[PDB]
Amino acid sequence: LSYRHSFHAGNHADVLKHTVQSLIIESLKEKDKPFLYLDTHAGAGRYQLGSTGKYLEGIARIWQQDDLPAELEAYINVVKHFNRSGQLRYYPGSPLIARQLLREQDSLQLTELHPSDYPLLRSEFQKDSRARVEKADGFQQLKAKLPPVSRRGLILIDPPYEMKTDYQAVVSGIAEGYKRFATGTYALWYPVVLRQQIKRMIHDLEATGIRKILQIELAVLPDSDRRGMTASGMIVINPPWKLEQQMNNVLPWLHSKLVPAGTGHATVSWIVPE
Numbered sequence: 001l002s003y004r005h006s007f008h009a010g011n012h013a014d015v016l017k018h019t020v021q022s023l024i025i026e027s028l029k030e031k032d033k034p035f036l037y038l039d040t041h042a043g044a045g046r047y048q049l050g051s052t053g054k055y056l057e058g059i060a061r062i063w064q065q066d067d068l069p070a071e072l073e074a075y076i077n078v079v080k081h082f083n084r085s086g087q088l089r090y091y092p093g094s095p096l097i098a099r100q101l102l103r104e105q106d107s108l109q110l111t112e113l114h115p116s117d118y119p120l121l122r123s124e125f126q127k128d129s130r131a132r133v134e135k136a137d138g139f140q141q142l143k144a145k146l147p148p149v150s151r152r153g154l155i156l157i158d159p160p161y162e163m164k165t166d167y168q169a170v171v172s173g174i175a176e177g178y179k180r181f182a183t184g185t186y187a188l189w190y191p192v193v194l195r196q197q198i199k200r201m202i203h204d205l206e207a208t209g210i211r212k213i214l215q216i217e218l219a220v221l222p223d224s225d226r227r228g229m230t231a232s233g234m235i236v237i238n239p240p241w242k243l244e245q246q247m248n249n250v251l252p253w254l255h256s257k258l259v260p261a262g263t264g265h266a267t268v269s270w271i272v273p274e
C-alpha cells in the first residue's frame with residue numbers, strides 16, 4: 001500500500017493539536033498504570049509530504065529550531081523518528097503520535113470511516129495488538145468503548161467539520177462519553193471557518209453542564225468570511241493539571257514561529273472553570 005498524501009498535513013492546526021495530544025499523553029504516562037487512547041476520527045496514520053504543501057508553513061518551521069521549548073520535545077522526537085534523513089518526508093497523524101508515545105501495556109482504539117484512509121490506518125497497526133482499528137462512526141465509539149477497563153484515558157475527537165452537523169455530533173458525542181466515563185480527558189479539535197458556528201458549539205458544550213473545560217486557540221489570521229480556516233483550537237475536558245501552564249509557556253513561541261508575520265492571536269482560557 002502507498003501512504004496517503006495531504007496538502008495540509010503538518011500545518012499550524014496539526015502542530016497545535018499534536019502538541020497538545022502529546023502533552024496529555026506524556027502527562028498520563030507519569031503514572032505507570034495502563035491507560036487508553038481513543039481516537040474517534042483517526043485519519044490515515046501518516047501523510048507523505050510533497051509531490052509543496054502547508055507543512056512548509058507549519059511543522060517545518062518548528063521541528064529544527066535551536067530554542068525548541070522542552071514542552072514540544074516529545075512531539076518533535078516523534079516527527080524526527082519518521083524522518084531520519086533530517087528532511088521532512090512524512091508527517092505523523094494522531095494515531096502514530098499515540099503509537100510511538102504509548103507504552104507496551106497501553107491501548108488504542110482507533111476509528112476511521114473513509115475507504116481511502118481506513119486501509120492504510122489498519123496497515124499501520126497490522127502487527128501492533130495494543131490497537132483496535134475499525135471502520136466505524138467515531139461518535140458512536142463514545143457510546144460503546146467507555147469506560148475503559150483501565151479507568152484511565154485520553155479521548156481525541158478530531159472531526160473534519162466538512163459537514164456542518166459535525167458541530168452537533170461533537171457536543172452530543174462528548175456528552176455520551178462523559179456520561180459513561182466522567183474522569184477521562186477529552187480533547188476536541190475544531191477549525192474556525194466561520195466563527196459563528198464555533199460560538200454555537202461552545203454554548204451547547206456549556207449546556208452539557210460539564211466542568212473544567214479548557215480552551216487553547218492559535219489563529220493565523222483574523223476572523224474572516226470566505227477566506228477558509230482562519231484558526232484552530234483544542235477544547236480539553238479534564239485537562240491534566242499542568243496543561244494550561246505548558247500551553248502558556250509554549251503557545252506564544254509556537255505563534256511567533258508558525259505566524260512570523262504577526263497576524264492572529266494565541267490564547268489559553270477556561271470555557272467552564274471546574
Ligand SMILES: Nc1ncnc2c1ncn2[C@@H]1O[C@H](CNCC[C@H](N)C(=O)O)[C@@H](O)[C@H]1O
Nearest residue numbers: 041042043093094112113114136137138158
Ligand atoms: N463519522 C466519522 N467516523 C470516523 N471517521 C470519520 C468520520 N467522518 C470523517 N471521518 C474521517 O477521519 C479523518 C478526520 N481527520 C482526522 C485527522 C487525524 N486525527 C490526525 O490527527 O491526523 C478523516 O480521514 C475523515 O475521513
